[PDB]
Amino acid sequence: LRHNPLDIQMLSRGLHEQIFGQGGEMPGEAAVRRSVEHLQKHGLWGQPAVPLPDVELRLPPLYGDNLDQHFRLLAQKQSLPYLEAANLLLQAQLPPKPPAWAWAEGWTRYGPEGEAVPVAIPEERALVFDVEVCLAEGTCPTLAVAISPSAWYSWCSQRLVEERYSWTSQLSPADLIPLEVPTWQEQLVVGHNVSFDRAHIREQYLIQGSRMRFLDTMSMHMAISGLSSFQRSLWIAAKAISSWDWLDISSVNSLAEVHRLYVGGPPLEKEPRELFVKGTMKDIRENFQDLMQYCAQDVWATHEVFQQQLPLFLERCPHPVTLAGMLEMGVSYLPVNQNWERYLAEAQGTYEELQREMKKSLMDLANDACQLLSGERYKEDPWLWDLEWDLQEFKQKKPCSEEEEFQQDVMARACLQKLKGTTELLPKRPQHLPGHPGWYRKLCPRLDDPAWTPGPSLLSLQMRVTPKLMALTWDGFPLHYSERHGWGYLVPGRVVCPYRAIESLYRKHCLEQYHHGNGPYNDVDIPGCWFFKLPHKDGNSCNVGSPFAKDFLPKMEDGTLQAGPGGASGPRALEINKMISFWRNAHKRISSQMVVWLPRSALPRAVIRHPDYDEEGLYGAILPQVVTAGTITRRAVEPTWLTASNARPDRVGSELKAMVQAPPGYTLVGADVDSQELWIAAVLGDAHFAGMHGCTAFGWMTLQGRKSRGTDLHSKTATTVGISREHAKIFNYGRIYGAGQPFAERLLMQFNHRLTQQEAAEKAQQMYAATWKGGTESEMFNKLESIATSDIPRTPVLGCCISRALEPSAVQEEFMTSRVNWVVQSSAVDYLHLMLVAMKWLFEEFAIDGRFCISIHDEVRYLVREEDRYRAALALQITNLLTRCMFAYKLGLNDLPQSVAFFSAVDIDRCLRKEVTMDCKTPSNPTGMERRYGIPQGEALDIYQIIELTKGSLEKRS
């Protein structure tokens, strides 16, 4: 192919024959009248159709008649062993639990009548596993129980039955639960929240791909009968404004509710002491039997729910691709070096240093303000007049040269000791600085605090006094706080109020030059002054907290928010707050990541032969605790890694992702889809009407997009609205996801000026309509609104039906927006699954020694060896092609543009970053990432370059 109707460049000559074949297709419906007419009325018949150079490569052989059968074949070949293993769990039954729990080291197998025999490993191709950890000691697992088809198993830790003075705090593979089966081989592990349990396995950290896979009950529950983020709160609270039939077909949170829903029967009892979280290790050492018996209930319930679950999952997604993608998608793996510990230490140190600088800046202000007590001078201040200046009286119960004179000093110290002996007249409970003022008293830690520090170390931002101490002003008027209305400011007008001081401050500020704003409430009774609320980014009549929010940083740069009359460096305080907030929030989670440092004796030889291999270096890995399909839309969830936040110039901890560095002798190969969340909708709308890409306006814009002229959707929308391209995403994704006219109203009120007022109700007409079913942007409604209202709503590509909590029969009207968005999000999920299965197949076929690393927020990364990096890129590139083809095939289209036939570029890097061409500089490391840790810049490639370096051959030998 070279072209097609509408003059859109298509797939290359040989590639189309290789995949599709010029047969079994119709030239559309032999009619383009409707498409041309619509593209004419909209006035969108531009023709910047500059061809892109074409290349020809011999694709890997495919199987079956068409691409769909090839994908099904590979998915079956991947998912056969694990389904077979799960069938064993389905079939078998097991005896009751043992009368008593053993006390040994490692693994013990319980016979039919409780006869416990020590074993090296469970030695089964199936399991239902639960793991418990003593939080107080650290992260080393304490004990576990496993349900096998024929027997019970219990694992007791070495740290639990042996007493030692201390244990290593650097975790190693030799201090984890083993499940090794050296050399059927395709082992399956089942559990509830099974990522946590997987994190505590000895051989899960080996660099080489592990043939064992893991399965979670919560993932299946979410997939089948899950709840949307909106549904969960109502489900819990009641335990929907017109229908409640869904109330009895979905569970929530704990395994107890899942078991109640799917099986039911005796309620699961919760341990009221929660020893594994609260009690110390010695408490566990004596409560062993009760705790282990409690834990066995969880595994029993998990087995029952899996029994009641698996057929439903096998029925809802009959397509094996879904199961293969689920199996692969929970096997993430993040390498880390000793640079991880250095990063943690440096980030914590910078956080502490900046926080201490700010705190000391406030401490000096407090110390200076403590001095106006003399002569009752504080009463004349227009800020500190309203505090408590009180003192509590201290109360109790009712020449010549010397000789040797060794006697004088001893007698003096004896007198000192005698005076010391008067301690019996002092109260047992000491007073707290009665000589200081009350407001100073509040900020001073008690004398008995184990971590007491000098001066007022309790002072910080976002307190009722910090902006009072700073003597902040708004437009030349001092700030004022009220109990019920929140922060604001005080305007001079017409315990003693310092009217004269405030008026003099205003007069002193006026020389350099009735106010209007928030309503002048007269309930706050200050006869000589007026209180005005500080405007919020939201509407009026809402309280506001600390004025040190990041919202006011630009406003302060205007020159209205000042601290000059009492202090200065307000912008500096806001700068530190902005730099600090992220780490302040996420330090506990980031520092708690379980890192297992692999000892030298078990590294692959490729990582010790390298010239970069540091002898002192520690080469470990972190296994993300991603709960696959943790949201109604079957998307993985983890608050730490799976987030769209990356290195920023100003944020201290934003360099988090950069610490995932390949081990010496290995590389990261990654990609990112070019606006897939929009391509899905565009292709759906296009295939709704006719069978050629670019049927309507939106497909034409997204296809052959051009950043230079700005014809791309993001840039076009940005120039239509006048906002930045990076900030335009919200303006589109909200509209695409059916956020509605109220959303396009309130965002336009809030985001910036000239879009508030009646414009917020008159401007969205341009973005949504022109002079209910059709009209410009409405042509999408006539497709999704049809697939989301069928008796069995389903993904158009793979074929899983929406959760039972959102069936048309269960819910009829509510959850409509989530219903429609589920189509696109699930389409992205199926894209990810297809990608993963395709690259596993290619890696297995062409003997590439890389493995999946992580898929963050529709990105995909892989860890490969250096010697094969180019191959990986090629594989990755070709993968995308086939996936797109699959989409085009499954929607009734037998063509594919070359614009979307490949990634923009494939990144080859030594670490994990948003883009190779940027250097991660943060307050935690102002020195460049290429200079602080010594890591090259990296680069990204495009199809032709990898073709030339690989000679167009994917086999190892050229």
């Binding site: 200076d368 106006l372 007698m411 002092l426 600085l433 000589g435 007491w452």
Partner: protein
């Protein structure tokens, strides 16, 4: 403009010594001032101790070193630096005349050659000990030598000499990680200089390069007249080390992992006198409450202030008050707390003037005893930072003070 008052206080309270004319910006910066007062000496000692404990004591590879103050032996003739001569031979010279036309004017060449010079930096002395200090760590390449000492610099007798006390660290690293260490040390040093500063934003740093293309970094303090250099970092590399021991280079080798290599020399040098001057300038007032609160006080950091606690006496039976004051003085001194014996001076000074003087001297706490101390042992204690006076029992004072200092040091 506003520094006149600061220098006046520094002179009055024996931080410096001399006269209004001798003490000036140029003289202080160059290093040819008469000297410091006892309070200045104590401040310098505190700063040196803090630098030593934050640089040398807490490291397991850093060792001390002593370098002589002069360089003897033959010299290259081009330096033109000052020279040392004993005049017990010049007196012998004055007894006769010999070739006094032209050749004994070329004798200035001998004067240049066979006369030693005053030490100009501690880098040369440290480098002179690189070989002998390899036995301390069994030739493990990352290792350093630290020193604190005085060095002499000519200044524009047409030209005079200025003495400056500074601390230098010479850090031998593997060549590959040199820059790494540089960065690290830079960071650390900056942090240290900002640890005690009341306004750390006044300290700054900037990169730089030499004509030979070697990296370097400099640290500056923002004095009221401008930015002044206070500490410099250099990645010397191999030039001086090789130029000092030509020939059998194998004796310069040291172990890095599994490879024996010639280390890169890195140099850090911070001037202690200018650091003390910067800290003195930082702690001054120089904001309506500032215009209303005229209290002049040097808010020196507790870990740096020369005098910790001041001790006085109220009216009463002088014998018993003197006894208890002597006991308390001995107890406080026994635990590393410096005290100002204000009880010896007569009561000609009122409380307000005493407070003003002690604030000008930067004393953390002022403790007062009375007959009430004899009867129950409750003494008065006024705090420099807050100027508030609490009652408190004697038996705890020592403990409290200790904790305070430690609880201010370990932040």
């Amino acid at each position: 403009e506003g520094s006149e008052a600061l220098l006046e206080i520094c002179q009055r309270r024996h931080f410096l010594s001399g006269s209004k004319q001798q003490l000036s910006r140029d003289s202080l910066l160059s290093g040819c001032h008469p000297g410091f007062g006892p309070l200045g000496v104590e401040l310098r000692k505190n700063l040196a101790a803090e630098w030593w404990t934050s640089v040398v004591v807490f490291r397991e590879q850093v060792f001390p070193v002593d370098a002589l103050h002069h360089k003897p032996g033959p010299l290259l003739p081009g330096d033109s630096a000052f020279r040392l001569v004993s005049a017990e031979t010049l007196r012998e010279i004055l007894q006769d005349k010999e070739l006094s036309k032209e050749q004994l004017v070329a004798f200035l060449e001998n004067v240049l050659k066979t006369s030693g010079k005053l030490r100009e930096n501690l880098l040369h002395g440290a480098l002179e000990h690189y070989v002998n200090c390899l036995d301390l760590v069994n030739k493990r390449l990352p290792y350093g030598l630290a020193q604190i000492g005085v060095c002499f610099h000519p200044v524009f007798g047409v030209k005079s000499i200025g003495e400056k006390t500074e601390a230098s660290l010479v850090w031998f690293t593997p060549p590959r990680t040199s820059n790494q260490w540089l960065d690290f040390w830079l960071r650390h040093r900056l942090q240290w200089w900002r640890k005690f500063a009341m306004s750390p934003s006044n300290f700054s740093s900037s990169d730089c390069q030499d004509e030979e293309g070697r990296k370097g970094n400099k640290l500056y303090y923002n004095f009221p007249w401008g930015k002044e250099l206070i500490e410099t970092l250099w990645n010397l590399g191999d030039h001086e080390l090789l130029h000092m021991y030509p020939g059998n280079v194998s004796k310069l080798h040291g172990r890095d992992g599994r490879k024996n290599v010639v280390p890169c020399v890195l140099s850090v040098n911070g001037d202690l006198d200018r650091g003390m001057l910067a800290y003195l300038y930082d702690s001054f007032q120089l904001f309506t409450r500032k215009k209303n609160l005229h209290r002049k006080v040097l808010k020196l950091h507790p870990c740096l202030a020369p005098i910790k606690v001041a001790l006085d006496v109220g009216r009463g039976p002088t014998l018993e008050l003197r006894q208890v004051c002597q006991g308390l003085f001995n107890e406080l001194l026994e635990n590393g707390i410096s005290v100002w014996p204000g009880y010896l001076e007569t009561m000609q000074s009122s409380l307000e003037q005493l407070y003003s003087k002690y604030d000008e001297m930067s004393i953390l706490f002022t403790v007062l005893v009375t007959e009430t101390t004899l009867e129950n042992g409750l003494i008065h204690l006024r705090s420099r930072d807050t100027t508030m006076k609490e009652m408190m029992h004697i038996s705890k004072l020592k403990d409290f003070l200790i904790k305070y200092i430690s609880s201010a040091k370990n932040v």
